[PDB]
A paper describes a structure:
Metallo-β-lactamases (MBLs) enable bacterial resistance to almost all classes of β-lactam antibiotics. There are two mechanistic types of β-lactamase – the serine β-lactamases (SBLs), which employ a nucleophilic serine (Ambler classes A, C, D) and the metallo-β-lactamases (MBLs), which utilise a Zn(II) bound hydroxide in β-lactam hydrolysis (class B). The enethiols inhibit MBLs from different subclasses. Crystallographic analyses reveal that the enethiol sulphur displaces the di-Zn(II) ion bridging ‘hydrolytic’ water.
Previously, we have reported crystallographic studies of VIM-2 and the BcII MBLs in complex with ML302F and in the case of VIM-2, ML302.24 In the case of BcII, a single ML302F molecule was apparent at the active site. Unexpectedly, when ML302 was co-crystallised with VIM-2, each of the two molecules in the asymmetric unit had ML302F chelating Zn(II) at the active site. In each MBL the thiolate interacts with both Zn(II) ions and the inhibitor carboxylate interacts with Zn2 and (Lys-224 of BcII/Arg233 of VIM-2). As observed in the VIM-2:ML302F complex, the plane of the phenyl side chain on all of the enethiol inhibitors is rotated about the C3–C4 bond such that it is not co-planar with the plane of the enethiol alkene, likely hindering conjugation. The use of a 1:1 mixture of ML302 and ML302F (ML302M) manifested a > 20-fold increase in potency (IC50 = 1.8 nM) compared to the use of either ML302 (IC50 = 60 nM) or ML302F (IC50 = 40 nM) individually against VIM-2, as observed previously. However, the increased activity with the mixture was not observed in the inhibition of the other subclass B1 MBLs (BcII, SPM-1, NDM-1) tested, arguing against the formation of a ternary complex in these cases. This observation is consistent with the results of our previous study, i.e. that a ternary complex can be accommodated by VIM-2, but not BcII, suggesting different binding modes for these two enzymes. We have previously reported structural evidence that ML302/ML302F can form a ternary complex with VIM-2.24 The SAR results presented here suggest that formation of such a ternary complex is not a general feature of rhodanine derived MBL inhibition and hence, although interesting, is unlikely to be a productive path for the development of broad spectrum clinically useful MBL inhibitors. Superimposing the structure of BcII in complex with 6s and VIM-2 in complex with ML302F, implies that there may be a steric clash between the naphthalene side chain of 6s and Tyr67 on the L3 loop of VIM-2, suggesting unfavourable binding. However, the BcII and VIM-2 IC50 values for 6s are comparable (IC50 =  0.2 µM and 0.1 µM, respectively), indicating 6s might adopt a different conformation when binding to VIM-2 and/or that it induces a conformational change of the VIM-2 L3 loop.
Author numbering: 32 to 262
Amino acid sequence: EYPTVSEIPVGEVRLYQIADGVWSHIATQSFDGAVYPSNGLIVRDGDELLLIDTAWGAKNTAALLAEIEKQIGLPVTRAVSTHFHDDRVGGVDVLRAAGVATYASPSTRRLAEVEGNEIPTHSLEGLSSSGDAVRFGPVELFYPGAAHSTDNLVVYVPSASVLYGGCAIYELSRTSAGNVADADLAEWPTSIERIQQHYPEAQFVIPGHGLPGGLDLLKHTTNVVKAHTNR
Ligand SMILES: O=C(O)/C(S)=C/c1c(Cl)ccc(Cl)c1Cl
Ligand SMILES: [Zn+2]
Ligand SMILES: [Zn+2]
Ligand SMILES: [Zn+2]
């Protein structure tokens, strides 16, 4: 029932209800002649919504907002980008022009600036050291350490036991490493270990791209990363 890469045409956005007031949003994008899926999260915050990550681009993000307006009908007041790559911050300008307050760690904002990507406005405090956790409305933000990127955060929704690992977590069908240009391969397994240590009760784990599963995705990503390490 979860929408796959092949069912979403580029430009469109699907929403998937996970629990009471917890959705993921799924989009697609073309890169080097191939089509990739991309996940984000939507968490109800009273009568407002917390957005996790853009839909990979200005066009997709504008369509994500229109789809939230149509399907949920509650305002997105804040948004967090979980690291600095285009699939997480591409569309921040759209969010900001819509009146959304955009957030990311100081590291993420700096790395986005250096990369020439869109820069979230607000700086998240309390996430400077590996293992740091901070509450942000209806979710907990967690810096597990460097993994897919030095700045990657993961998001936990306590009300529904939903762990959003972002691009630090691979889907099961991905058996080889993606683009690891900005990754810390040496530390990636340890960082996943921290996620496991801090959210062992997680029932529903969302990767940055592809289908969700359980906590098996953590060990799965460790296997792929270590396999790539021995390439
Ligand atoms: O594998 C991933 O999860 C990501 S975000 C890969 C990537 C990188 Cl490393 C740089 C740039 C862009 Cl656009 C993307 Cl998609
Ligand atoms: Zn990335
Ligand atoms: Zn503001
Ligand atoms: Zn990604």
